[PDB]
Assembly symmetry: D2
Amino acid sequence: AGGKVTSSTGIAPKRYVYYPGSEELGPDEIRVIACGTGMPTARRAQAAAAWVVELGNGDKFIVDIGSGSMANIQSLMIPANYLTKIFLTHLHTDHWGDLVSMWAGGWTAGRTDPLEVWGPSGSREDMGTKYAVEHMLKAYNWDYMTRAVTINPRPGDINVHEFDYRALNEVVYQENGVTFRSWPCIHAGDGPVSFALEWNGYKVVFGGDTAPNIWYPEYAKGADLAIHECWMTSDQMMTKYNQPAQLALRINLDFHTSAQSFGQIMNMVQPRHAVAYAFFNDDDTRYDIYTGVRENYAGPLSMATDMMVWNITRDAVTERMAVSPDHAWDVAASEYTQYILDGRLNVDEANAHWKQEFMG
Amino acid sequence: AGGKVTSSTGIAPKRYVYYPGSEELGPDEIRVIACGTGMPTARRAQAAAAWVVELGNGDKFIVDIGSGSMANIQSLMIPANYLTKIFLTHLHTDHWGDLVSMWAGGWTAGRTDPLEVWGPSGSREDMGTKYAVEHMLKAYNWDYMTRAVTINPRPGDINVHEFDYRALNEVVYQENGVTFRSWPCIHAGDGPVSFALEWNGYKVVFGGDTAPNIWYPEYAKGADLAIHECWMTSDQMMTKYNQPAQLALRINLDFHTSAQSFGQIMNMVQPRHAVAYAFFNDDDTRYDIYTGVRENYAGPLSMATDMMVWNITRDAVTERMAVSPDHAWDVAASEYTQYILDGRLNVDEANAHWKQEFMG
Amino acid sequence: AGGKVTSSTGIAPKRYVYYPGSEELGPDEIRVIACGTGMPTARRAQAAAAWVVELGNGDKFIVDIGSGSMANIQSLMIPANYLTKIFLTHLHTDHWGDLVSMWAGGWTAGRTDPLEVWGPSGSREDMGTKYAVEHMLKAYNWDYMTRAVTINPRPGDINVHEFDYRALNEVVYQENGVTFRSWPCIHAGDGPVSFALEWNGYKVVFGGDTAPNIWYPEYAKGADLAIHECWMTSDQMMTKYNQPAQLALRINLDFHTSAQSFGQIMNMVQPRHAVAYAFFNDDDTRYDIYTGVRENYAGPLSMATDMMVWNITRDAVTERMAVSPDHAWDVAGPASEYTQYILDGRLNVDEANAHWKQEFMG
Amino acid sequence: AGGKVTSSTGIAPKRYVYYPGSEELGPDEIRVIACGTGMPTARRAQAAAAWVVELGNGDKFIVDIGSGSMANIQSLMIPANYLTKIFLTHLHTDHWGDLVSMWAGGWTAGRTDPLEVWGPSGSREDMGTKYAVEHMLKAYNWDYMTRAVTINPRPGDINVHEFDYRALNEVVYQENGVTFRSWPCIHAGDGPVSFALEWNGYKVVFGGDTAPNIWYPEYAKGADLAIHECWMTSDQMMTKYNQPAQLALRINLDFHTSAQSFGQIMNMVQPRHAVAYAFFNDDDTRYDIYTGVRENYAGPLSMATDMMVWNITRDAVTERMAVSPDHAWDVAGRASEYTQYILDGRLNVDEANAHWKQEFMG
Ligand SMILES: [Zn+2]
Ligand SMILES: [Zn+2]
Ligand SMILES: [Zn+2]
Ligand SMILES: [Zn+2]
């Protein structure tokens, strides 16, 4: 598997796995990494929704930054200041829970520019991204004010770009040859969108969460990579949750996109490559989910899980797994009263040994 | 290792690893699980500070709940209803980032009681935990209101119980024979505290984060299990961050508790079992930190990483590693406008087959 | 998922994962654990073929024990002396390379009984299981003789029970309620067999490796659990090994059982539960294979991977995943070969060991 | 950590982890990977002893290839044809258990040369490497004879280079400016050795298994990288095994090199970098072993676990961890043994396979 090795001391070419930080990105290539793929229950195997997109022009975007996804995003060996632009499909903790982590960790990790967040409005002020993010910064006001005494507060700003959720396939971002469009989703309440990324003849669709809708099939048409919610089966709902027959059946019709509905949508969409995500990707769930899609869609399919990567080139959309470090590292008025400062323990004795040795 | 197997068809007793959900807890026993141990930066290997405490009387506590920890907590096979009481040491993202996941996750996962949070105050209203939590709920208003359409709101609420950060060893909690005390830390700015749980002759101390202070040694004295911050070497600061000598030296004296200061501190306390946490616990970092602690302390010492467990009994404080599921599961006015509900797609034909088989 | 918790202090019943050593086995119950499932190349995610069978009467059997599988077997918290009976389908290293590790490791782990091995003959002495084990013990003569000096050598013996590979469903083991029968496979050359284990109304079938054959569908009929070979697609063969199309086609027709053939077989067999194994179980292989299978078979299916487990009860065959320790340890159950030339090289380390020795001796 | 990233679209330089297959090896550089580091009992976290050595002149070696290590070796994306030369310290299953897997595996993975094995003689013919490998090939005769019907048999040969175990720091190998030398160990019975590899101004020492001896401290002197056995404490022996106090004591003195002894040895050697291995590398074991060493040795020190790697340059010896695929694959670089009796048993599967077959053929 992978490219043929041509020398003892050389580099293995077109490696069968993606090692993050190890591969040059071509000027007509997109890299998409799933840094989170699993619904609202927390689990080490699948963080909540998060996508990192690297474009051959040097631009990088995050779409969704769900609870737990930062551990994956930090494993990519991308400097913080290259990852400042974040698009939110909607305000479920499982789609922006780890914004606080990117904001706080990313700042310690050496980001020098503000975060730029694009997110939907809701049906009223207090149901949109602008309200949400302003209250998140106040929530973490003790973190912000204590950090800023010692680090210039510029990287701690969040420039929110709130776009109308109601808009049908309109531009929300246009810069340096890159366009994002939003259209609505049907999910929990008014606000959630899907995004389409267009650049250099490539189209990547980030479906977010939704029950099936008439917009995604129309506006996602002929995507290189189409990502859509794809729910576990009703049988699995009963087995895993103790759900009645009634509630279990209702969930795959009104609340979530069934695997079979996902099939229908990708049959309509005709993408180069479809990606099902949101479900628990386990040895006893994945197969009946896959069979559901296959009733209705026959074309190229990935069943998303954490750290799956797609390379989009003119000739191919190639699925691989990313092999990254679990033991990840970053790659490159006082708020104290005299009362607290007075409580410092003397430790000059215990430290004098290591201390003298280090200063030569 | 472990106890002697006695039958072919039996159960291994006194197992050398802790399997969460597999062991009855004794009426005179405590269980502490590190659900996060590793600070500023995210990494799959170490979530941010979180501690689960199980008492033999049946009360369960969480002390800190940092970004990432929810995936560890959910691998314990504990129902949502039994984890409702959370204690924060401070308002750093890496000690309450996942409170939102516990909040939103537990509520979709059958929890029937609100969360209860105890955390300190700051030098002023916008620097304490009552401000923090109020603004977190506003930040997640879209999630709050959308969820409340389909699930009684009472679990969504968060009874906060702010207490003065300046107090020197004062009860902040007392129900069902359990007592928590707090006292100050010297960390980033005014507000951060350490806790001491006293129950049924047992004392467990959670140091949160701090530079070495005079209150910890005095109020921690004779704990069964004593947890305190312990940091990377100055040499490791220079190698991992390219910090110059001056800044590297000073971070181990002014800003954080050195390995050697950790030792001095635990010598004064003389606990049954000391725990060092907060450092990145890697094959090249951990070793020199242990040689630091052992310059000044010779009693029983754990170097925490995630899913490390302590059984506190009358006889012993015993460290094991927990071996828990990566593929974890939960164990047991509308906010839509007609503009959105008008976009629902017809999937009836796509879904007819599985529907018909599922009804028979 | 799993059973409802009904106390803060208590045990979570009927767990959604198997924690090895944590569950009582019922008298009318079988536990089968996959301790390897993977093709002829090594990888940490899949050891080479290995099955542990636990019967409710307290009998335990290893069927196949390929390279890598011992790390999985040793994670089950089963004492070495309970795992003394081993059945080999065939003499590929991926089916018995770890017998050496069970022999040596299991002994230091506290086996006190000799190992017992059942395996086919071949077309001549030197192609059979007796020859192979006999010469495996000679290969490890240095380990054996050095170990045996001061110790009872009884646990180092391997008693081989060789049986005629050509026999059509004949008994090869009959002890304490338990029957094993074997029948041929078609695979590399004469010798490889499949096994049926019959006990207390249950029938577990271990296919080993084969091209599709007329025996397996006859003698596996009605198995509670039927394990059979199932191969990567020809397309996967061309992607992963740059096979020309001609050879890739033939690999799935002549040498191995295809997913579609596997489907034809389990349709014919009609078990309570079919297991597919012996393929690399990856995010980009597994789906095409499940599809191939479902063309022809509609009944309960497991796609095996390392540490998958089935509970066979009267009422269900239940698949779970085992969650076991990676930092495993053995669990307890109930003429010198030195010259003076080598022993005169011992380094004086009294000084260096003084401090720890004194503390330890009180 | 790591080199400064200079470009959005470019490669992270001097990565803080080693991704096997992602780095050019310099002409005056050595890379050493631990592919097994673990005690005598099997576990997923730690294979039995195996070291992969890559030199900047293109030569590659394996020193030891204990049970389980092939999974780690196969994760390095090194073609089978570059990994044909194997050095064994001694004939414990934990130091050559996976020779069979490399032999069979690398032959299907496409090796086109014979394996070349260097190993020690014993006090008599049946205690040496030549006798061991001979009987290993007879053991796996069914695998060899069946494989040889469809693949050229040349790469199925193992050329054994047996060397005098008794020799004191003599050459066992000299080729292309690369030397290996051997000297005795004190371990189980006569036969075990340590190696030193000398090339282009560099010296790398592979200790094997030994109680403290007078030869390692003398011949390992001034090594760039010095590897030596280093055991778990007597307290840990008592806890993990329930050894009675006096047995636990003797194990750290007569049978195995204690942490303190290792310290004395490395204090005498003065290597650029020392490596302790063979102990179960756990949260409740590793720290007291490290303490023990630091009683007697203060220089640079690695506590080996699986997939740790050392880069050796003129400037430095750098420890990192290797991050490699669990889901590994190969990377590319006579009479039949069937009787008609077996071949007559083929199943008709023409119908089940017609659909995929027609589609695949265009
Ligand atoms: Zn959502
Ligand atoms: Zn803090
Ligand atoms: Zn075979
Ligand atoms: Zn040995």
